[model samples]
Target: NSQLSTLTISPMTYLALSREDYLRLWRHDALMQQQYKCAAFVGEKVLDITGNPNDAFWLAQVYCCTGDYARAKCLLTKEDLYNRSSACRYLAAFCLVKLYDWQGALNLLGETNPFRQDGGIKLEASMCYLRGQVYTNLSNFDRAKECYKEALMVDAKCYEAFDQLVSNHLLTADEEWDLVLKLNYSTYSKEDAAFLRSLYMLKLNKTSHEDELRRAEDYLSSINGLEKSSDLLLCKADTLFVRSRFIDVLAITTKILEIDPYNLDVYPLHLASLHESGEKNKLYLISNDLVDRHPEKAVTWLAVGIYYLCVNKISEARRYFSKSSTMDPQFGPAWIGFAHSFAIEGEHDQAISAYTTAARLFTHLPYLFLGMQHMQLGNILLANEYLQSSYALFQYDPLLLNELGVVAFNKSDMQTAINHFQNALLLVKKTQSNEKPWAATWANLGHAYRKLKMYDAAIDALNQGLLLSTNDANVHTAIALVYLHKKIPGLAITHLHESLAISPNEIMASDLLKRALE
Candidate 1:
């Protein structure tokens, strides 16, 4: 027997051996190679040959490894192996957990003596971790955290446990940093641990740590595994997006999609980059393709809706947005898109209702849309209330200031309108290139000045606006009004004729010219 123990057998010789010998050899080879299909094949043969409890238990393990939890449960439960082998019991409990039979898993785990010396520390740690995962699923976070801690105590290098703890968000930043530092860098989990630490550093101090950011990039780049490459690329893409480097974000997100086509985070960044880059045609095509591929996914439908909205296809956009909202009623973006489509179609009441729903779902934003809709509905006071709320969020936005000025003008608050318009003009001047000044801001200022009977200032502002937007019929009409107020009927007639020439449907200019002739 001692000499026979020294004899090592090859897999080719298994066919020449007894049934038991052949099965034992094949099982070893299958498991050594981590070939689950081969393991299942050999396991079935072993069960057919032996029809014994040990063979049944081992076959159940194979099934569990292959993710056939139903077959694993059938074999393990039928053979009643949970009381015989601790390994079989753990595997059966894992299958139960996968099937969402949390109580069954807990009962099986509770029956095992995890701290027994024969069970081994590694096995005990894994059980603790699994139990923690089950508790997490059940929303028993405190109990789950304790189990994770127990797993870490049993195996100091339990990176899975550490990763779970980090993801729980229960620990303070300093505590997390300390836990990350406790990870031994010489282990197999060094790359993943480093990546997690880098993510934390980036989150804590995005702009202050240039060298740390570069170091984090280098660490992620050095990871050899393709399994985590998509995550690494996504992290890089997120950093680029935060910096407003939209083209860089697009490039990285495209690469991420090539590697993992179903990546959830890549689509939003990709669409946003395309929108920012003014690639409207590409946006439409890609969004359509996404909808074709993932018709059931609400986000894909929402993307297509946003694309149609951008292209001014309001009715088509509304149909797609409605589909998205129906698919996921709590999705704020879909409701927001629906509201935008309604507003574009001049359905103010419907737009307001949709926006209100979106606001309840997502309370942080939507003030701007609410303000604009209220203004359209002639609720000037309500519009100002919402506009002021948005102003609190974005203090220096030129468009917000312009909307405020419009609201003031509608309320006949001429001085307040001038003040808001002047501030908006200053902001535009600071940011505008030499290409053209904002004609809308200049026109609003002219209107304000005209309301105050400041003829020279009104003429100067309106003429400046005309120089920038020469074919703006509304600007021409406004300048005609300014000239008429100055008692220059000839100049007023000339501007009114120019307005009518630009837009034959300029009813205000036509009526004003008729009155001047009378």
Candidate 2:
């Protein structure tokens, strides 16, 4: 009804208004009649008519809100500057983030720097706030804080920015609480507020403010109405799981399933939680239930497969992972899981083929996974080609970059390895995503830097990796090896001991430690 009134009044008069003002008016109109769908439709039309990258970006947003990621991505690809525009870039980045195209999203965000664009400060600031949200999702608190800070710099009134900054410990709680006064959050819906608060709470480390987290959880609970709100339910379960309240998490998730029996993705976490809390039989029972109901879902099978893997039931794990892949040929994880199962059995060729097939089905970064498969089989040439191709397709995945660096390290192309590792670090620094950065990247970087006699840079990168992963004894041993080459016996001995303490089974570490001591 409200939308119809606007339509009857004449569209030309609306065009004279500023875009933000127009958006605000439309928001009010949409809310007045409880016509979210109609409002979203209008927003898309506005984007279509303006032909602005921002509009195209919002069109994608509308699509995403409705759970149509395929349509969102397709719409985004049509605009010339959607990748660069602050209005939609964060959402685009989110699309890639979900698909594990971390590098692609990071590259686009890096090039655009959408969060800090001066021309559209409001929209850019909003995007910066949202980018922080994505970072929180990936468990990258450091980068999330940076984006949040930049957002506040652009718009001091941006409450989301202040909330994230405080939650991440980039600012004090008092500072954020003070900024909240200047913000009129009446503009945001209850759901949006809860989501934002939940995001802020999720970014905190163990040393962070517990009171803030409690408050966030309370707010989230207040907004929780739907029994089968998969996203919210998952969040709640994860919170309990993290706090070691496994029983509570299982209960909550059990309730969730009662509301929606077809949800298979949560099986892994739910089963793991039950197993950890000394409910091994419950884990098996739940797995059986899932396997029976969701026979077509590879993840359901994989959940059971992981349980079998942990118990050293090699044949069972292999069977489940194999069945999972067979049922869902397009599921990359199922294929990769099957490959690992084969690898554990010493069926190297089968593992390589499985990994390669999985890679091909995953279009975003097929080469990196494929490259790893090739390297596992000692096909260095093919590995190099695939890694290179993967790099060209998407530049931000630290894992891929790390793999390429490893290949360079293997080839004794020290300078090349150093370059790749250093670039990978930069990419890691740019976004808020949880990418597993193995010590190999740093170990290889340290080696190359040592060869080039860039000792200080070498030490910095290696030390960073060490701090992140002290127990990766192989990397520590590699660092010791580098020190040994420089005739620094004392340093080498120190690292060698540390390495052996963490990984007594590491042969290279044991040998290096013996050499260092001798």
Candidate 3:
């Protein structure tokens, strides 16, 4: 009997592995190696032979991996551990989420922080991150925002959490900087802190080119591989574009294309730079290449549309834009180009129609373009409504505030108009090194002051506007009006002559010229 029963051994133990080793191999094989179905047989055997609650969780994971949510969820529920186990709790919630039971998933996570230590080791932020997903699905964005930030704070390595926060624009530009500044990367990852911080800094608002450029160079010098990173270079190009350094943007964008062809992330900025910097042939070349390389991409058709517009074929440009939007209904650039095409052709009704579609299809905040278009068409009430809608969603938008100031001015509320313009200036100038392009806000403020009979204030504001935009014939005429109101005929005549010289078609300035002479 001893001779007959002498030769039995498992492959695992024969390889000097324990039962736990076999179990670990089984779980890891299915989980990490994506051989779930392959290992399911072993998992069932382990669960059936062991009758262990922990074994049930492993098999449940295998079941979930294979798309058997009900089997996985019920397998775990059969255990008595329930809420005592974070692993069990999270897995249950995950399955509940997979089944699309929003309330059920969230209820399992609970309003209380699942990340707290129960007089022992703490849970990971992954639970809160899933809760963020649950809240996002339920349209509770305010809670979702809090959850995302909390997820990152709980663990700085949660790039998924950071990505959602940045990509969805859930934070204000000011808030985005604060998030990078305040995150505790050192506690979680020591060597990666500065490197991580530098990476986050690259992708921030890019509102201040001087400060951003300084920081980018600072990081690029300290970090070893950031210069090699196409993503980081794209962010630098984005900052340059914000500074109106289109030529610099083109240089970086072109370099990125050479290094990583079909890098669609760089295409948007490159296409914009080409359009702004007046490289018609370059635009034609890029558009042709994109259409050939990535015919199915929404941005490729957008490039084609831009090339058509630049070449003065407005009708053909509109068709490509329309096709791009039709290909990807939520693609913002195509919709914007389509609206711009109609706007350039003086077909504002169609522009409004395109923007309306864009507004409806895009995001929670889609009223910016519609609001601006409405203001240009002199629809004060509707513009105010749409702009207010946008303001409620994003309070730090400088352009929207300026547009709101215009609406308030048109509605004859000088005090409110002044306040809005000041707020607009407050945000725009906060992080910029060079003068802002939105000097029109200053001109509007000057007009508002002139209407209020504040000749001195009007002159001061108009001069500031002129400092920013020297060739603004309107600002010169407004300054002339302010001088005439204050009985300064010499100054009035001087400004009128300046205004008339800039734009001879200004009949108002010509009449004011005669008035000053008299």
Candidate 4:
């Protein structure tokens, strides 16, 4: 044994070593220096000579180091390896964490002595950090924060703890920035620090200026090799979304999915960007796929409901929305979807009830829906009050202006209707080219002009609406009325016939056609 220990074996003399030599090298390579590849080679040699479960467990750790998680999981879960190796239990716990088995991870971690001083400080810190991650996933923010703090106490240079603390919003933005700036240079966590600082800047920038976004980008660029980190990529995607660079959001989110297929957080941003980019068919397809993949997630069902709403399948949309609400009673969007579906089906009372619940849950968007529902119920005064409240919240919204115009028209206030419609049209004109054209604005303006006895202006407005929407029987009928008022019975009858052809149930057009003929 003394003579063998004194012998030096080189790579060129690999086959000359005995079984004892292989075990010796495996212990030296794996336990002492942590050279995983050499350790794995010697471990395989030792296993070949002895068929040891402990050797197999050590080899599984090599697979984990090389990011072959499935292989590590398979080997570590072997019954003999599981029962014989404490190290195998620890590695198995880490595998469960990666697999998102939060309860299983907690159970395994509870059996280990995370606070044991015999384990290195780094090991203890890592255990604390992992437990924090488990708590974070379970939505126990306070417990997660305490675990992160315990990790920091164990190892002050634990950049992951700082990152988690920042992400959990446990620190104020200024406090986070201060802590990030204090990270030691020798510890080499500056990249993570810079990324955290960028996120904080983004959060603290109230007006969300391009300058703030540029600063965040600059901070990200300062990092040497974190361009593909999921956190940074998601932050970039969120920043792009806030800037309304939806095409860029789509690209980045797609890349994120390619990198991590189970990252479901990107699905909402992807669907939103696709919808904004006018890829309706793609949105529907992706939403359906998401529902299939994540059937238990309330947001997945909500997405399906949104797709049905976009396609005008109100009843189907309502069922999906109801399912989402039942899945997660606290999800406000599901309640809002129910309100919208009820409103579309002309169930004003039910719509109001749903909107009231949604408004109680989330106050901002439901006010507009409530106003529209009140208008549908013919409560003009109440509708006007609610609409004005909504306008106060969202002054530049064209839909609100258009609805206010409709309310004015119902009150027979021709001048007020014209002004509101004009304002709405001006706002609509400022929207992007891919947005739906304001054919309704032109048609409503035509009606207001007709009520004011401006026959030529009514005809011109109705013709403009026809250019945008040729199949609109209401616009055609409005044009026929203008022709009748201009004492052109033949033109009026011709336009009436066109309106009736477009919509077989155009009662007003048919009545006017008979009167013109008489």
Best by lDDT: 3
List model 4 lDDT by residue over 1-518, tens digit each. Answer: 10111112222235556665657555556744767778777766776776666566667667777777777767777665644555555567677777778997887666333445121235456667778888888988778877776666555556688667854456644455455444443232434655545654543322224465577767776778778877677777766654446678788999988989887767666765665676768768777788788889987888888788667889999999899899988677688888889888888898898898876553224677788788888899989888887776556567778888989999999899999999887876664323345788788899999999998888887887878877778777788888888899899888888889999887898888888884
Per-residue C-alpha lDDT of model 1 across residues 449-481, encoded as one tens digit per residue: 999999899989888887877778988889888
Local distance difference test, per candidate? 0.73, 0.64, 0.75, 0.70
Which has the better TM-score: candidate 2, or candidate 4? 4
Model 3 stretches with alpha carbons more than 4 Å out: 1-16, 26-31, 49-71, 80-84, 116-123, 190-192, 208-213, 277-297, 320-330, 349-518
Q: Candidate 3's residue-wise lDDT over 11-86, tens digit each? A: 2334436675586567656666878866677778777877765566667777887899988778776665446456
Order of the predicted models by TM-score, top scorer first: 3, 1, 4, 2
- Model 4 misplacement above 4 A: 1-263, 272-280, 433-437
Clash pairs, model 2 backbone: 103-396
| Residue-level lDDT for 111 in candidate 3 | 65
Q: Write out the backbone clash pairs for model 3.
A: none
Whole-model lDDT for model 1 versus the true structure?
0.73
User: Pairs clashing in candidate 4?
Assistant: none
Error of 3 at 169 (Å): 1.9
TM-score of each: 0.60, 0.44, 0.62, 0.56
Residue 228 Cα positional deviation in candidate 4, in Å, after optimal superposition: 7.8
List the RMSD of every prediction in angstroms: 8.8, 17.4, 9.7, 10.4
